[PDB]
Design a protein around this nucleic acid. Structure first.
Ligand SMILES: [Zn+2]
Lengths: 55, 100, 96, 115, 69, 68, 112
RNA sequence: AGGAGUGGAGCCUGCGGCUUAAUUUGACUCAACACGGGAAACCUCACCCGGCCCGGACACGGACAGGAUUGACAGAUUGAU
RNA sequence: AGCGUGUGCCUACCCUACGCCGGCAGGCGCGGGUAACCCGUUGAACCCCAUUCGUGAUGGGGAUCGGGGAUUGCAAUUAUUC
């Protein structure tokens, strides 16, 4: 039954296919340069990745 | 016997220090060495939003990441280049050796 | 929990040679990447591990998807009682 | 009063003719519904509705079939049946005929009322 | 006179399916019989054409103020 | 909690006492007499018994419907 | 990710900070702490346990990572370790005034 | 003093209002009204119509191998082989 | 003209040059690039010249509708886009 009803929607594309690397949420996602991050956790974890603000 | 070493780093002053170290080493090794080739740099422009909510002024920010890649050209045999590659390392750069 | 007899044997023998395990939190994931020899979902894996920590034999903390399960010494004694090996053996993280 | 034509062919000409030229017979949008490949991924709904349609009824109104699925094309062998389209809440019992062949089943609806 | 077949105002007609240029009164006849056919099949597009609504998918929540009253 | 709609039952295994003598027919002489068939494939052996319907038949796990 | 792991896991030991090293075939990372007897457990149990954690979580070869324990003097500089130490001094329960004035006296005696 | 414009016209989009199965909401001057990075066909979804799996860990005490779950191929039903 | 972007971790969704079918959205083989090299010397629009223009809601303006054809995805009907 549920062994053949878990996978009715193969997560290949769409919004539910991709998610953030932090909180498993799907809003404000950064996919440029492969961060897979939401914006707020990117802000509070921006300093320790080797980024400093210049301009 | 053309061998090339590409030098990239997060920072710029440590990159120039390491590049000066390898240029001075190839100079005291008494061989034919090309000077430090100055490749153009790339700038990572990232723009996010300040407000976690949608309240207040629409104040964006600008995030900059500076990548600095360089290369030098050597005319030394392979084992000497491997030894000077394996010596004088730092946790800011990556070593990378091409034989061509 | 509904899971086969060989599955808990594989889980406990992986716990013996590897005293800690990691698992990514997902329900639509029929294959465990580190346990490649047998097809197993990680769902029953952390079901068994939350059973162990809730009855108080393994420690528990959470990180981002990945739990980290540090076996206590009495939990290792209970598991070696369950698999009935003598306690002369050690997990592979104890040899120096 | 007069026998209708469907871009050249008639009712029995639609009835006896199969898919590989029926696709050219209707529009190119409905070609994409069947031209992608094999229809045996999760087509238990499709197969059971085709068998229930192929079940021959006695001399009365045919047996009613209703589904929550919406994605169908009005097919020439599909007409002559009583179907209830899943109009949001309750299966809206509609009457069909071999005239809107080449269109979709969800295009017979009104939501609540005009305001 | 050797025109391409796609360069015609209506294709795959109800009457024969032959692609041809349709005259002005012919175009009015074709439009009125098409609206009558959609009304007779009581379709959603015919219903929105009866009510003066939108079929091509645009929002009249903010526009179309020059309709009723 | 509960709605106005009644709950749906499920096929539970009813408690039947001493059904093992329903496997073979216990005769006088020491030879086993069986009223059931088996699954002739090698995936399931003769130790696995089958589903006793009246006209059709069922294998162990192969789902091979054996009919006449 | 590893830094947030370390401040999540080393929450009773005074974790200061780390800096990774980019080196081929020996991916070494160095961990700064305050109590080096409580980072190892029973003669290096916890250190090799964390080594096994990072190996099986981040996909590393057999024995590639090595965890190095080091100490730093003048504790008043590291503010996140100081915040975790004042967390240590108020985890059970105290008045904020007396313990806050005590840690103010300590960080002004340190030479700030 | 001056340039470009909105408010006039058509289109795009957000909110208020009426509303229905609901058209889920937070935000009403600067400091909301192309905002939550939100350009909603599936997911989004937290709104409505319709049911399966346990993700009741664990503990107490009753069932328990002489058997306790779960997984099922003709055919009526449904939304499913 | 210039700041840019690039083969993906579960990742298939990258930029596409070149040769045929076709009026076209597009279809098939064909090479390169982990990147000042390959797109690309980014042959961009706005401009400049020569025709059709000439004040009539006109050749301005493209909102109004249906038909036909490609592509995306498991599927676009209440048009996905073109
Ligand atoms: Zn069998």
């Amino acid at each position: 039954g549920h062994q053949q009803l878990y996978w009715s929607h193969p997560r290949k594309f769409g919004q539910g296919s991709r998610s953030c690397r932090v909180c498993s949420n799907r809003h404000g996602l950064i996919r440029k340069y492969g961060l897979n991050m939401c914006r707020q956790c990117f802000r509070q974890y921006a300093k320790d990745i080797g980024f400093i603000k210049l301009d | 016997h053309r061998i090339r070493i590409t030098l990239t780093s997060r920072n710029v002053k440590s990159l120039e220090k390491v590049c000066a170290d390898l240029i001075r080493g190839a100079k005291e090794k008494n061989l034919k060495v090309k000077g430090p080739v100055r490749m153009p740099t790339k700038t990572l422009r990232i723009t996010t939003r300040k407000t976690p909510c949608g309240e207040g002024s629409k104040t964006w920010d600008r995030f900059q990441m500076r990548i600095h890649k360089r290369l030098i050209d050597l005319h030394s045999p392979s084992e000497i280049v491997k030894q000077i590659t394996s010596i004088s390392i730092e946790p800011g750069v990556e070593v990378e050796v091409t034989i061509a | 929990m509904l899971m086969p007899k060989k599955n808990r044997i594989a889980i406990y023998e992986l716990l013996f040679k590897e005293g800690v395990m990691v698992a990514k939190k997902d329900v639509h994931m029929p294959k465990h990447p580190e346990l490649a020899d047998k097809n197993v979902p990680n769902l029953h894996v952390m079901k068994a591990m939350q059973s162990l920590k809730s009855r108080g034999y393994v420690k528990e903390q959470f990180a981002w998807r990945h739990f980290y399960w540090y076996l206590t010494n009495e939990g290792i004694q209970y598991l070696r009682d369950y698999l009935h090996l003598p306690p002369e053996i050690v997990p592979a993280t104890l040899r120096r | 009063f007069r026998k209708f034509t469907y871009r050249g062919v008639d009712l029995d000409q639609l009835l006896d003719m199969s898919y590989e030229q029926l696709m050219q017979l209707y529009s190119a949008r409905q070609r994409r519904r069947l031209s992608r490949g094999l229809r045996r991924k999760q087509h238990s709904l499709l197969k059971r509705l085709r068998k229930a349609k192929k079940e021959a009824p006695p001399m009365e109104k045919p047996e009613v079939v209703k589904t929550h699925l919406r994605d169908m094309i009005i097919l020439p062998e599909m007409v002559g049946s009583m179907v209830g389209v899943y109009n949001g809440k309750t299966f809206n019992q509609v009457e069909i005929k071999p005239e809107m062949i080449g269109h979709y089943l969800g295009e017979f609806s009104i939501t609540y009322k005009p305001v | 006179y050797k025109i391409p077949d796609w360069f015609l105002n209506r294709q795959k007609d109800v009457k024969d399916g032959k692609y041809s240029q349709v005259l002005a009164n012919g175009l009015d006849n074709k439009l009125r019989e098409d609206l009558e056919r959609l009304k007779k099949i009581r379709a959603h597009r015919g219903l929105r054409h009866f009510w003066g609504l939108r079929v091509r998918g645009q929002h009249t929540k903010t526009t179309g103020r020059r309709g009723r009253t | 909690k509960s709605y106005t709609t009644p709950k749906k039952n499920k096929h539970k295994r009813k408690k039947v006492k001493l059904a093992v003598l329903k496997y073979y027919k216990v005769d006088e002489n020491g030879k086993i007499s069986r009223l059931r068939r088996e699954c002739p494939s090698d995936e399931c052996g003769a130790g696995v018994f089958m589903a006793s319907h009246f006209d059709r038949h069922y294998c162990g796990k192969c789902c091979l419907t054996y009919c006449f | 990710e590893l830094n947030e792991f370390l401040t999540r896991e080393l929450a009773e030991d005074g974790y200061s900070g780390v800096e990774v090293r980019v080196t081929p075939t020996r991916t070494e990372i160095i961990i700064l702490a305050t109590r080096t007897q409580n980072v190892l457990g029973e003669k290096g149990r916890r250190i090799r346990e964390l080594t096994a954690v990072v190996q099986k979580r981040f996909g590393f070869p057999e024995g590639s990572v090595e965890l190095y324990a080091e100490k730093v003097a003048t504790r008043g500089l590291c503010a996140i370790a100081q915040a975790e130490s004042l967390r240590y001094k108020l985890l059970g329960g105290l008045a904020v005034r007396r313990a806050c004035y005590g840690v103010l006296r300590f960080i002004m005696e340190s030479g700030a």
